[model samples]
Target: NFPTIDRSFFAGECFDAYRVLGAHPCRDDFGQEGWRFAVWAPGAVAVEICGGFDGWGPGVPMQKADTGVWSGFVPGLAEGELYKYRIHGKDGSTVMRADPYAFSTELRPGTASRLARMDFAFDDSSWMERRDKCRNLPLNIYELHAGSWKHKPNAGSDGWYNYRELARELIPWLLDHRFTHVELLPLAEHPFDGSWGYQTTGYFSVTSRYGDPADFAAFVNACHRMGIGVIMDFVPVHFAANGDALANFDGTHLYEYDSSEWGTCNFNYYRREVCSFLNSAAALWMDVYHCDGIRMDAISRALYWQGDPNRGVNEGAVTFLRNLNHGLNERWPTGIYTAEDSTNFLKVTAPTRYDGIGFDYKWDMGWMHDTLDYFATPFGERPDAYHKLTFSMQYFYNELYLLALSHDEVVHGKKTIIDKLWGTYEEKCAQLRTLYFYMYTHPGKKLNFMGNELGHFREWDEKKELDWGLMKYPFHDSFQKYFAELGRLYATEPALYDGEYNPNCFEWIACESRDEGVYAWLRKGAGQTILCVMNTQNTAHKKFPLYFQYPCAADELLNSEAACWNGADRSRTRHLHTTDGGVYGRDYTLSVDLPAMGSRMYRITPEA
Candidate 1:
């Protein structure tokens, strides 16, 4: 038995492997034969015929090379097949594992090893004609786990639930929720267990733990039919250290670096196959699932270049992403690519060449961190503590942040939003309403994981079920309805969704302890506006006048401490600011009487 040849000797220099934000692959940035793949396995010194894409088999002749870098050729193995090297180590123990840097796979338990057929619907000449119509559609995303969102109740809640259920049951729920997009957890196969679907195995194959590939497509079709965009979670940094699964796959260290955690070889992207794998997988999601974008998981680790093995860089992923970015522009022009990172790396969403890495958006972990602290800790009136991130009108300087209730403060032993607020039920509810009021009014896109709208009390449980049992309560349902109303308003208002390019959808009015018990801000959109006022203390103030930044008059919009959400007494306060020859459109201020931990939002319209 001879060790298989690794593909890498293309001309002379080595090419890097990489990935972008699509689902599958079709063509390259050059529209050449296909996204080319170059592999490297130092143990494979000599070999004759070879193939990748589990689409094909092993090698023919065995020959040892001087550098021990064997060579092979496998044409047309783009985005749908799994591949591995069979190194005939001089002693010949025959080893095979998934390519650590593969783009997508059709077989089981490996990555950078499979390739899906790239020449399918990607050739759809009408793809662009259709995408143009949706160029401006706002992405109102509902993040969930397909397996967890809709599971077969009678089926013991263990094994995988097929796709028909998701399309039939879950899709409609999304519609009712008024979400324009759904971000699913990783659909790629993984060795299933507790882990909340983090441990991956089959990089390309849709996890049988759920259902077949066609059914997976059916779910996407269902979403598309409902006019909703889909995004999938993708892990590029590392893989599970399951030996029977992905550790040192081939007789040689074919897919990864010289060193890796748990013996999981870090991918050698400089190899061509590595680059092809990454790019092709992104295309897979777009062409196969029709997903509009990708939320790359642990990207900070992936691009770090030197950190954890899963986070190290080899230039392979970026090379693939650069080409993927350019290709996507030519393909769907309006499609999105988002980066999930904790550290705000400018290049994560910046433009390339001059030094930006082409990502449409990045999560604003800063807002989440600061806001969570504000709600979790006691209110501070000091100038410092954490820059009053109460809203992110300044978020543009960083990048368009999504007002995300992502898996940060919610899961893994962390407290739920209410628990984090630190108070009794009555007090908690008031604080919660104020937080939502501010979040909705803040400047940024928004994405909430399942049950976030109503406030699920526990961390996301994928294997089990959501506390659907909780929605029955009056307060919970009211919260749900209120959330929907705000979302509806956000979707309806062009000024809000279109950002400041359109109007002052969100203009901060005031927040400097003016009244005895409140903090307030005014968000004015075209024709309509609201001044959100919050009072964290318990005393009822006398003459709590909110200062105005712009000479704006206040009209009663709605108050959180009213009969709604079962709050205390409410009073009507409409004070108009006098325009005393003062200049407008500069820094402004406001003041208002706020209920203890309760808030109010008023429409601030100018007297016509």
Candidate 2:
């Protein structure tokens, strides 16, 4: 039997509205087995259910309550039945729309919602119990679009791998490379494949491009069993403007604002029902699919009016964000919530109890831009932009930041990460190695898109798989090895991951050498300290002295210029003892060779 939806749902207080509002298999009061369908359409004069059961003719009449929720029970309807809601508007115009909270949808080119029960059993209790947001642990995320990751020839028109196939192929690779989590591009159902699932159509429905909800569940289940977390990219800022979707439901502007931008319909955050819908969608991921984290996309668009600072803040969107984050955290305390916001909004990661838009982490967009810009500059001009590499530390503590080299930087002519470096092919490879060395040791969690580690030169395209053939080249193969080793070091090293948010754990040993393009820093965790030094210019310095707080010995951990990475195999000094000297406000110093475009890490121990 259909359970009575509580009155709190109308006030947007129900975070699990999907439990009652969508089509559910149930027994009616008369003991007849069928499906119960419900929808919210306050502006509708009449609503009907049209489906394959009745040959798509005259619809089954539905009853409406005072709260504007329409519901009906259709006998003999079973799972796999396709249906749509036909609404008669007040103006006498009628339209057919897919169910907003449908659990499944017909594969694209067909927009009907399918009636299917979510009965997939997950055996990931151990992973669930141990999962936290990883604030103090290593978080190395590999971001990728599932469809383009790989493809099977003759696997239908799109040649895409199903969720189960991807799980079989992707999990081992992720483990081999030591990624803690895999952040997938949006999986919500959308009509256009080119949108990359960003322009969401079915919030509650996982895209049919891969497989059904059960297949996706198996994928997540497999990931959990292998000790890897999954982070889903969610788009709540805007949705596709398809007529059969949420753009204009009930023949009116019910789900979106009257005004829109970005060639998409903006969500009506001011409406309580809209808030309930979006909140329910966000929660559905954690409640049903068991995603370890959700990274909200284009959050700056919701923080401000059309993502422009010239316009003031969007108060309605701000309220919605706070409500969403607070509610998600309250229910799933261990699940991580992140914001892809680029604005200088204050207290983004603060607790909502303190009147902030609560988020566990915010992508360090400013740092990404600055670091990339510095790398892209001409080597001769790099001295003038030295601060670009050091400016991130000035404001790193304002929020919990995740340093990301995301897909956005690799698509639409922006150039891949390796290609963005300013130099000849070999020089670019050397600089990229240094850049990654710097990125890993920096005081933040890390995320790298799939192809970036391959040193892929071509821009990313949704239509094709990553250039895996690049692995055959010596430089690309060596670069991938270097990246994998770097990730392992980051994951196993306590000094790199622990106490990252504490400012006292990080310090600059050298940042003033603009002419020489050399920067150095120290990361201190409990009983462990790491020193990172890099040279950005094409000039090697022999026996460069690095100052330390106490007399200590240094052991080389990893060198970007090592012959293993196809570099100029410059120096062989693996260990150094502190000498009696003082520089950069320190009482002791260690002299080491610094190769051009090279970066290295060292384990420091104070001499007894």
- On lDDT, the leading prediction is 2
> What global local distance difference test value does model 1 have?
0.57
Per-residue C-alpha lDDT of model 1 across residues 353-423, encoded as one tens digit per residue: 65666777777777777777766655444234434554444554555456677755577888777667756
TM-score (all chains, Cα) for each model: 0.76, 0.98
Q: Compare the candidates by TM-score and give the number of the best one.
A: 2
Off by over 4 Å in 2: 153-157
lDDT of 2 at 370: 96
**Candidate 1 residue spans exceeding 4 A from truth:** 1-91, 96-137, 156-160, 244-246, 260-265, 307-320, 379-386, 390-396, 500-506, 514-519, 522-530, 536-543, 549-558, 569-593
Q: How far is candidate 2 from the true structure (C-alpha RMSD, Å)?
A: 1.4
Shift of residue 387 alpha carbon in model 2, Å: 1.0
Compared with the true structure, what per-residue lDDT tens digits does model 2 show for residues 466-552?
888998999989998999999998998889999999998999988988988999999886558999999999889888878887898
